[PDB]
Write a protein that binds this ligand. Sequence first.
Ligand SMILES: O=C(O)CC[C@@H](O)C(=O)O
Ligand SMILES: [Mn+2]
Ligand SMILES: [Zn+2]
Length: 444
Amino acid sequence: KDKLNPPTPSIYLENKRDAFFPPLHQFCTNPKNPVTVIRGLAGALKLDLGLFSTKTLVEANNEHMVEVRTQLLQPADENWDPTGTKKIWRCESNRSHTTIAKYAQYQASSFQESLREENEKRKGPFKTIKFGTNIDLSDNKKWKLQLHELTKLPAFARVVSAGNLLTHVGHTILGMNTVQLYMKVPGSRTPGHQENNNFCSVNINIGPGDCEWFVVPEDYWGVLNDFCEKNNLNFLMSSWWPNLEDLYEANVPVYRFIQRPGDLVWINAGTVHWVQAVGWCNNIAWNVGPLTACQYKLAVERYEWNKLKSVKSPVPMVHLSWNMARNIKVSDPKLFEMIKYCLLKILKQYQTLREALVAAGKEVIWHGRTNDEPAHYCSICEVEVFNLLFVTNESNTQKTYIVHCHDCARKTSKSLENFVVLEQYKMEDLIQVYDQFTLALSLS
Ligand SMILES: O=C(O)CC[C@@H](O)C(=O)O
Ligand SMILES: [Mn+2]
Ligand SMILES: [Zn+2]
């Protein structure tokens, strides 16, 4: 079907009015639109993309760290096994580190070398390329002008905003509520994935070259998971590059489009995607969590799925949920009932655990909390741990407070005799937050 190669939801901006126009906000967050390409976004805002040029980055922080992925330069939209014999899903992507100055040097000489080849005139085997990924632009002192330029965006697409759930986490989640930079040469590939905890993603192409994007709606992610599992690949942890003929045969629709310099790509919640550089360019990206039932639901679902797959969730959805209930007036009936349900479950599980401890003669020690203290995770299994923290007798005495979850503490120490139980929140206070959390009226 042509329904298997659908058109890209695409908004064409001319000026600031178009960018700040509220139906643009609603369009991007509509669950029916897996991706929105906002064309001409930088131009409409007079964004200085030059602040993100390789030349400026070198001058700014030439020793800054870059995660290098070394890859094969693959043809078009395909991924071949190294012997050029068959198209496979697994892609080779070895990791090392470099600096902006060193990667910049390669980016520039790669282009000069391509110019000479174009002037030398005229299955693999395949050349090797390097992709500069995940460059951390969280330090406002090192990247003042860069980060300030992005406050010019409409609020819904900003790294920080009142309506961004990731703003409401209350602490830094690297690469999610902080900007990541990518420095690319032709063929630089970001393999298939969903965002961390299915949060939306915002990507701007700095240029000067284009990127090519591949997008599959969230509700087909199970199909791609089976493909991975049948191909001996971890959907969440392995590097894979879909066979478009496999997807077509399985009746999976694939959105496919070009992102030009200054185009902003909005990846909606849970949308599966992979990307390749067509030319030489940089990109900047971060996540955003719109206050919708769809975003919260997909975030919760991935959070729970990660536990089953023994994968850490970068977004602490328990911590977030209490912050939402404490600080956000929620007027969507569906969203409200989702949050209320989740808090009630947290609350009851917590009450059950606490009572089991008390009834077994285990003491619960009041530990309180520092405000804006990040969520905790289990030092062993990396699950989020909320309120009741399990700390060894020695870590307690040393006041290092190395957190464990209950299961891991119990597996270590059968009667928890090697652990103390630290309580960060009084129950009455949590019950109060829950009770005071009611549906706000909005006429919108
Ligand atoms: O630009 C890339 O290659 C990766 C970025 C993409 O995963 C995004 O979510 O913005
Ligand atoms: Mn992404
Ligand atoms: Zn654990």
